[PDB]
């Protein structure tokens, strides 16, 4: 139980200052600002993104009243967009509207891929722009935009669309390697500060450091965040994962070094491959100069709510037990770890998992030492699985005298479909893998034409035998088959998103009663 009425928060500052002066307000703010990732990244990591609108929407009011000083709720994009329709038979747009309604004072934040929005392949620029436009209309305020190779040119189209919608453009730089390790100088400190400068020139309102694998160490955070805030006048926002079991040390080191905002997950959905623990981070900062002004008791009450919610999702828990410094060897993103281990098991490799993790490290170096986050991380995963399955060393893989049928994801990456790493792709590997197909080095989206949006609209409208909304059309553009299947299941089953979670997954026992609104 909350209050009262809702106090104005960051949403009202964005609305009244605009995005560029909102970022200046963030920079100036002495207290550290917090983003709660429980409603997106937390359950994407721990529960296969299966958390339902029913459980998410029901707590948004509580956040609004109890934690009105939060920077944002990260509550959209990443895997939620397709999973909600494909596996939960519900509309991601409706979920976002309910959150908006329940939390009108807090910024709502999505993770967006620069190249393709929330999609699964490359799309024409006009499609990517159309989606950003709808995301803004549907309630997104703060877009964290990233590219899987840190290729700024592949982020421009989305960045410009976000700025056009007058929403916040938080341009992310993905962290990899180790800036304090002078024997891996490719991803050194200048690498990151040069990128932050390029992204400011490209119109970012905020710079993020996206540490998708939880690799940034505390001593490195101390150097990095100091250097970033000297390199750009923009506010900096730090996102990490707790796979190593020490990511809260890095978050606290970032706070001390002056970082403007940090992400964390409610305790009940924190730790391991999720973000580090929000309530404990806030406790560590309590009474300090940068105290974020969030009530620990309310954090615990909301966490207790998430703990009881999580219990309903027992079907989707992984068998992960704790911290793993193995992360510093493999560099698998926290969001990938369980998926890849489950894939290895299905391929008969469960007993050679640590061999797969080493093949993943070797394969990363074979590709030239690249940034690994969706989709590049999947490519390195596919390569590693094949290397273990077929007993191929990196030398075997690249040699002119050993035939290899490369995974499709690998062929497509070396072809150029994921963009360009700063070094280009290794020539001998690319030649072997492409088997005569010519690679390209331009921005993939520059090769796709313009989609004919009025004709695509008539295709889905004919199929469903009705008009669709602009939001539904955006869903169809991103995931044509998944959206179509969802619209047809919605016609048969109605608003199943309103059912409590146990009834959604298991129905009603004999004599059992439910309430649904």
């Amino acid at each position: 139980y909350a209050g009262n009425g809702v106090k104005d928060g960051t949403k009202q500052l964005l609305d009244t200052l605009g995005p560029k002066k909102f970022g200046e307000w963030m920079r100036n703010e002495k207290r550290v600002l917090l983003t709660d990732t429980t409603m997106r990244d937390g359950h994407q990591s721990l529960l296969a993104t299966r958390m339902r609108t029913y459980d998410i929407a029901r707590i948004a009011g509580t956040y609004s009243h109890a934690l009105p000083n939060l920077l944002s709720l990260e509550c959209w994009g990443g895997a939620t967009f397709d999973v909600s329709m494909r596996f939960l038979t519900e509309d991601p747009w409706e979920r976002l509207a309910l959150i908006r309604e329940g939390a009108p004072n807090l910024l709502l934040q999505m993770l967006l891929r620069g190249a393709n929005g929330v999609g699964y392949t490359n799309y024409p620029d006009n499609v990517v722009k159309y989606f950003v436009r709808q995301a803004a209309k549907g309630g997104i305020d703060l877009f964290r935009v990233f590219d899987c190779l840190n290729w700024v040119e592949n982020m421009r189209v989305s960045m410009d669309a976000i700025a056009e919608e007058n929403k916040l453009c938080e341009a992310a730089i993905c962290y990899t390697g180790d800036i304090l390790n002078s024997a891996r100088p490719k991803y050194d400190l200048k690498y990151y500060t040069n990128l932050a400068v390029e992204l400011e020139k490209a119109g970012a309102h905020i710079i993020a450091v996206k540490d998708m694998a939880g690799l940034l160490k505390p001593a490195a955070a101390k150097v990095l965040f100091k250097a970033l805030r000297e390199a750009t006048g923009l506010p900096i926002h730090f996102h990490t994962h707790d796979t190593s079991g020490i990511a809260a040390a890095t978050v606290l080191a970032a706070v001390e070094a002056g970082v403007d905002a940090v992400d964390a997950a409610m305790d009940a959905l924190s730790g391991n491959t999720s973000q580090p623990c929000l309530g404990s981070i806030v406790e560590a900062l309590s009474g300090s100069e940068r105290d974020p002004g969030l009530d620990p008791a309310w954090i615990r009450r909301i966490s207790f709510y998430w703990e009881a919610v999580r219990n309903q999702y027992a079907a989707f828990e992984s068998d992960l037990k704790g911290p793993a410094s193995e992360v510093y060897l493999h560099e698998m993103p926290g969001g990938q770890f369980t998926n890849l281990k489950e894939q290895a098991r299905s391929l008969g490799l469960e007993t050679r998992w640590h061999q797969v993790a080493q093949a993943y490290a070797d394969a990363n170096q074979m590709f030239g030492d690249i940034v690994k986050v969706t989709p590049s991380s999947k490519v390195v995963g596919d390569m590693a699985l094949m290397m273990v399955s077929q007993d191929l060393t990196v030398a075997d893989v690249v040699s002119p005298d050993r035939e290899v049928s490369f995974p499709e994801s690998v062929v497509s990456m070396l072809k150029g479909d994921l963009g360009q790493p700063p070094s280009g792709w290794p020539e001998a590997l690319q030649k072997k893998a492409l088997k005569g197909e010519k690679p390209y080095t331009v921005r993939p989206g520059s090769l796709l034409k313009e989609a004919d949006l009025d004709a695509e609209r008539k295709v889905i409208e004919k199929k469903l035998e009705r008009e669709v909304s602009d939001f539904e059309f955006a869903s169809y553009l991103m995931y044509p088959k998944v959206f179509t299947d969802f619209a047809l299941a919605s016609d048969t089953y109605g608003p199943v998103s309103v059912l409590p979670t146990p009834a959604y997954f298991y129905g009603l026992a004999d004599g059992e009663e439910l309430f649904a609104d």
Binding site: S346, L347, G348, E350, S389, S405
Partner: protein, 121 residues
């Protein structure tokens, strides 16, 4: 069945209808167990025997080496000589030849028995 050929038949057990619409009657025939499946026509299973059924001959057919439940399907239209499906009991069933698969009869979190037809080239 003829003069001097007397069979002793006992009805030992009758199963629930299975996912294929078939009921198994567990008989004892001359002291030996015999399982016989029939369609549960009484509950609407006319049109039923369901799952094919690999021919040990052809190449062509991907037959289950073992009973279990399928845990993952990795394919639906063509490649190599590659994991096609896995079966939990996880194995890990590989393509024996180069080709394009033109049917995937699974499926699954489906239960299967050795010789069930998994996929067709």
């Amino acid at each position: 069945i003829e003069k001097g050929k007397t069979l002793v038949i006992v009805n030992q057990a009758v199963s629930a209808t299975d996912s294929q619409g078939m009921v198994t009657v567990f008989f004892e025939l001359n002291g030996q167990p015999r399982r016989i499946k029939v369609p549960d026509r009484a509950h609407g299973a006319t049109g039923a025997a369901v799952r094919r059924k690999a021919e040990p001959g052809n190449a062509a057919h991907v037959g289950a080496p073992m009973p279990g439940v399928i845990s993952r399907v990795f394919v639906s239209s063509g490649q190599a000589v590659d994991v096609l499906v896995s079966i939990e009991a996880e194995t890990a069933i590989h393509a024996e030849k180069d080709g394009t698969i033109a049917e995937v009869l699974v499926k699954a979190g489906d239960q299967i028995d050795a010789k069930d037809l998994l996929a067709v080239y």
